[PDB]
Amino acid sequence: KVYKPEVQLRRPNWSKFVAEDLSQDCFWTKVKEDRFENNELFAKLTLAFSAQKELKVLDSKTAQNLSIFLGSFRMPYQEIKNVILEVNEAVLTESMIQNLIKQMPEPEQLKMLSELKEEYDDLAESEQFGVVMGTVPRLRPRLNAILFKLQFSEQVENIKPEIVSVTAACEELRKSENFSSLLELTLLVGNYMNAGSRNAGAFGFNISFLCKLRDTKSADQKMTLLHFLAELCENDHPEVLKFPDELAHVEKASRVSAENLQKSLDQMKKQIADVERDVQNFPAATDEKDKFVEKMTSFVKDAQEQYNKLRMMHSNMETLYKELGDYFVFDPKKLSVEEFFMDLHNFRNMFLQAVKENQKRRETEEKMRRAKLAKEKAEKERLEKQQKREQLIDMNAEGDETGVMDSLLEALQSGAAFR
Amino acid sequence: KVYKPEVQLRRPNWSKFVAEDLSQDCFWTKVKEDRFENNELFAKLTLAFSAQVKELKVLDSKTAQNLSIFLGSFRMPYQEIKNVILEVNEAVLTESMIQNLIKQMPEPEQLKMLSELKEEYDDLAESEQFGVVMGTVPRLRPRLNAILFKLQFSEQVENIKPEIVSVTAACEELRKSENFSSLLELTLLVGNYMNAGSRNAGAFGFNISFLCKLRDTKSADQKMTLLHFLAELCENDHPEVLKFPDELAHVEKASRVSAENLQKSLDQMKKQIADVERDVQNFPAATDEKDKFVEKMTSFVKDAQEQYNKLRMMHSNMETLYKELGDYFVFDPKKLSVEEFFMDLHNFRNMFLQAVKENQKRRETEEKMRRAKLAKEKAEKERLEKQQKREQLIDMNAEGDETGVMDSLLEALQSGAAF
Amino acid sequence: SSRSAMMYIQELRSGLRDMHLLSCLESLRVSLNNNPVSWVQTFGAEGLASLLDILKRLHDEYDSRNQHEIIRCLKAFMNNKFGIKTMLETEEGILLLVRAMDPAVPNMMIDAAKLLSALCILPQPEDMNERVLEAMTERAEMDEVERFQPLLDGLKSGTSIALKVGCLQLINALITPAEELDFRVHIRSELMRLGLHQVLQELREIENEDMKVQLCVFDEQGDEDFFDLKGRLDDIRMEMDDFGEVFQIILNTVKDSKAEPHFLSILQHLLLVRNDYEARPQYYKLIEECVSQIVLHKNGTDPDFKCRHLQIDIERLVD
Amino acid sequence: ESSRSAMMYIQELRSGLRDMHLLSCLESLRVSLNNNPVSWVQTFGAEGLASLLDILKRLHDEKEETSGNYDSRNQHEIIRCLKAFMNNKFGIKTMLETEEGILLLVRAMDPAVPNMMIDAAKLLSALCILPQPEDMNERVLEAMTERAEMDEVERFQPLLDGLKSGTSIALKVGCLQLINALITPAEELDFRVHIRSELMRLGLHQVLQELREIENEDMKVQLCVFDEQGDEDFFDLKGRLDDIRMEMDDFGEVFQIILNTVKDSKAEPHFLSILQHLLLVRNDYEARPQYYKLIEECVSQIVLHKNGTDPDFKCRHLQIDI
Ligand SMILES: OC[C@@H]1O[C@@](CO)(O[C@H]2O[C@H](CO)[C@@H](O)[C@@H](O)[C@@H]2O)[C@@H](O)[C@H]1O
Ligand SMILES: OC[C@@H]1O[C@@](CO)(O[C@H]2O[C@H](CO)[C@@H](O)[C@@H](O)[C@@H]2O)[C@@H](O)[C@H]1O
Ligand SMILES: OC[C@@H]1O[C@@](CO)(O[C@H]2O[C@H](CO)[C@@H](O)[C@@H](O)[C@@H]2O)[C@@H](O)[C@H]1O
Ligand SMILES: OC[C@@H]1O[C@@](CO)(O[C@H]2O[C@H](CO)[C@@H](O)[C@@H](O)[C@@H]2O)[C@@H](O)[C@H]1O
């Protein structure tokens, strides 16, 4: 057959057969095509699956990327130049500035465009804009330093938090006596098991080993050294179970990156040094719209202020950690901060779970003892009821007995048969 | 400190700290070792974690020790063992026992070498006595070989048969399912309208492998697929089609076989009977009457080359059905394995049943939303009518010259009218 | 005439007392009952305020005649859309009307209860009934009684027909205008706890047209409510056909609530149903028919949670 | 005294005696079995017993086909013989060995012949009481059940008829006694409840009201047994509840079990309705908890019915206590 649909539908891109040679005496030959045709069918079907001037300087690629950008941006080329000189943040945005830096012609192209500032109305719209920028002295330094200022507040807050977390963790750990307790307990229990071993009488173990306690199982691998320590705490030292709460920042610290932090700070100090060097080479402003050197010196101050706060906090953070290492006896230099707080975070989580698993074990154990009790009480209750029934008639001894039935009946009459 | 427990306990193989260079002014230096000690702690803990002859003349050193252990667990007379093997006494033989003998038997050279020392028999060690006895049974290795193949024959017949049955049945279930055929015709139709005006338009059939892909053709908003659509069509206008999954009961079993492994597995039962046939034709004439080999392995080689033929039948047949299916649905039987073909179909079947199910939930959800919309309008209209009735008492806005506004209200309350 | 309306305002503000205040209010009444609306606008809000300043002074302190008279003036004052509107704009106007409902002074309460009742009826503003209710509440909180106590006291035997009828009508005026079925049931049930049911049984014996009318209004509304709640169930049956879904919903409802333990005890007791093919469905059925009488309680009231012997009838009412 | 006469009796029995002749023989036989040594009985033994029962079978069969029946005497005399024959360990054991003996005892329970029903019910009750074999009660009951299917009547009918106002105090006491003998020896609580609930559906509860008035020591004894046994069954059911509370404290796990229990049962829809109604519980912070408490009291008083019987599912009024 042949169809003709008004609306072009999405199709199954199969590989077709054609009657000619493709068919023979198969299934497909004996197929009545109208056997299923409705006009409603193709109705419902088409419903669901329907498929509804001239350039005097710039190369051809730049004039086209600007022709785009510019048509979209839409702002007096003069207004733009103004917001750049004033550094008017009332109009500036981070995105806005980055587009400018990416779209901007090269410095040479702008050089050759501000020597053509004679024939202004004669140029393509993509070079009218380029002329206007050819004015602003030290354009790219201007833009970069502006961008940095736009980004500064935000890039501080991707640093402070982490240094806070990690500092907190380091303090929390050193101050948690419930954690100290668990450690002492562990040394005790460990030193007993290691009796007569090479590991006998230890003054301490490495704190990293905590996540391995669990690996120490009983005979029937039904119990671990961690569940044991946790049950001990639960039964005889409830106070220790509270240590997971005395480490609120350990989880956040485990997620930090001491490297990215070290870099992040180091980059901020370079970016200030770069701005600082653009302010110290800057032509004295021709006109009063050029509030640059003014605003950036104000800024390069505040920036170095905040930066130095940060570098403190961070040099302090590194000291805490290095002292953690003195205190619990480990090589700070062998284990990144996060690796360390991850091991600790993992341990804490294991411990919380051990406690839980213990509680469920103890429940399952009650259940099984109580069943034993009731099932045994049952074998007694009945054995005793059976014994009372055999006190009526012993169905096995004296044969030449009569009155057996008269006995049963008197017991029944009197109540005696029932107990 | 120092302990001395009675029972070794499982321990933590931590790395220990010693007071020496290891401690300084750390956490461990300020620990009170006895702070947690009990004799009960160490009691619970000790509970949970406690830790509980004759000279060779032929045989190599290894073989001698193996036979020494085997003949020790086996424990049967070396003369008895000889008998069972000759008579083929099936009341004693086991797959297990005959696979031990083959495993432990000295090389034939080591038996020839011991068969030449049958003189010093009482002087030989156990391992070699056995060797001399077996060094006697003619063509021993072929004899144990043939004897096993017989013990196992039954079982290997029935790892071949049920698979040959499944594929055969599935092949029949398909060829004969008119409800499945229907679904194909309905698919071709829809497909054709959809492909109207493409290179695929007016197709006389599609390749049946393609079914698993129908679902890959989504609607405008990818909320609907060609497969759910086909499945709705059936639900609404052709229920029978929805029974094809039940008409294909063996398809899943067929999807799980291995053409390759049946071919190999049958061909090997061919060579195994041709290896035991010739092991009865080259066989030396029996010297004594306990040697029922040439006798029983001639009654086997007949019955075995008999069942192999019946399987070879079913198997040549089964292959024929699949080559015929290929002719009928138009696909190359040789480019696509049996199991591959039925796995594709089995998968499609599942896709179908599931599309059906998801359609229903969809329709339920469309109901719920509609009834909910009816009720939302019913209520919005309820309250507006009830509010229009409240305002027939008073319009707090019209004329203010009227006195008795409040006398009107009280006569309403008084009579019931206000209600 | 218009000169003496400005005067009233200054007489009320002069500190008249006893019978002098009285003869001034009696005249104020007739002036209001007799001069055209425009004269009342000329008495206006500032004069309303002085009635109300006095009303508050009297309540705070045989005052009866003075207070009651102020109530007759109020009725007169608010016998036109202007007065009513102005009334509503007062901060404590509706509250003082409420405080006038002293079953001690049956005739004052009767008059105040009609005004309040009329207020509940108004189309605008939205939900007058609730603002009346709010005032009833506030009074109730400062006297430390139940907000519906005064209403129930007036329904009690020795009190005049007129007061009875007036209390029931105000009750009907708080309930009937309410949009939400949940609200009506709330209030009805609150009255029932205070003893309403038993009081209605006594008023049913009295041949009195006005009383029959308020009773018929009250009953029909119970009925409509009951009927509406039967409908809630029909919906539920249509939408919650699934054990898991229903189970989870109940769970979220009762969790962290004094109802959780009970729901657990219900489920635990069901497990105790005798494991017999015939009896088990009958237990469940019977449980189900008793749960129905309890939850779909009749007449749009909660069940009496305080009765020590609750009676349940699972025989059919009509055939 | 003679040991040959036991063999003669076996022969007369099989001779086809009728009326007063068969009766005069039974009466002699009753007396022989009651006076001779147990060894005499053994000689009569099984073949004799079987001869008694073949007759009893003929008599119960001619009384189904009749209108006015002097037969009572012979049937009843056969029952008197059985007692005598079972008045020793041998006879009892021999009886239980029969294929139709317990059934024939049951069929002698006709309230219109009270003194015969009395004697036959005593023997049945004695059988229930026995320590060996196990579960004699259930075998007696199986027979009562088979009689019931043949006559097409409730298997506990004849017992309730025997308790009705008209009948002698002696017959009432005998009917209660056999009820007690069917129920009390059973080890399984559910079984005691099943049976008792069954007797109640047939009207047992009202009859009990009447019997508690009767000033009769034998009657009080049987009532006290029945009552005390009911209280003990209630006490057990209450203990199952304490067990459930201890074990099943998780909403989900209990729900899944209730479900598994009612699924594919007439009880499923009722359960769904119950849950739905809980959704309808007024949504108020004070009233909701009280609704649930009231509902829980109602469920408790239904499921833990007192006196170890089921609730009366036909009674259409309940008084929930608080
Ligand atoms: O103020 C009204 C009010 O109080 C609440 C909650 O405390 O109910 C209490 O007051 C009612 C009467 O107003 C009494 O019936 C109480 O038993 C009660 O605890 C409340 O529900 C609400 O709307
Ligand atoms: O639909 C509500 C309702 O129906 C009535 C009378 O038929 O009871 C029926 O439905 C209830 C549940 O609502 C079940 O308990 C039934 O057993 C029953 O026949 C009536 O009580 C009423 O309120
Ligand atoms: O035959 C005893 C018996 O029957 C069962 C199951 O059919 O219950 C029924 O039989 C009793 C009387 O024995 C009647 O009350 C019925 O109404 C009934 O369907 C079963 O309980 C059982 O033990
Ligand atoms: O503990 C069994 C039991 O308690 C009593 C009396 O307190 O009833 C209560 O306990 C139950 C469940 O047993 C709940 O239904 C309650 O609402 C209740 O106060 C008594 O009936 C009895 O047998």
Residue numbers in the entry:
A (entry chain F): 754 to 805, 830 to 1196
B (entry chain E): 754 to 805, 829 to 1195
C (entry chain B): 132 to 192, 200 to 457
D (entry chain A): 131 to 452
Copy text from the publication.
Here we report the crystal structure of an autoinhibitory complex of mDia1 formed in trans between the DID-DD and FH2-DAD fragments of the protein. These diffracted to 2.75 Å under synchrotron illumination. In the crystal, an asymmetric unit contains four chains each of DID-DD and FH2-DAD, consistent with the heavier mass observed in our ultracentrifugation and MALS data above. The linkers between bridge elements are not observed in the electron density, nor are the connections from bridge to DAD. The mDia1 lasso wraps around the post region as seen in Bni1p and Daam1, confirming a universal structure of the FH2 domain. At Leu1169 it connects to a loop that joins to the α-helical region of the DAD (Val1181-Gly1192), which is bound to the concave surface of the DID and ends at Phe1195. The interaction between the DID and DAD is essentially the same as observed in the previously described DID•DAD and DID-DD•DAD complexes with backbone r.m.s.d. of 0.6 Å and 1.5 Å, respectively, between DAD on superimposed DIDs.
Formins are conserved actin regulators, which function in formation of stress fibers, actin cables, the cytokinetic ring and filopodia. In isolation, DRFs are autoinhibited through binding of a C-terminal diaphanous autoinhibitory domain (DAD), which immediately follows the FH2 domain in sequence, and an N-terminal diaphanous inhibitory domain (DID).
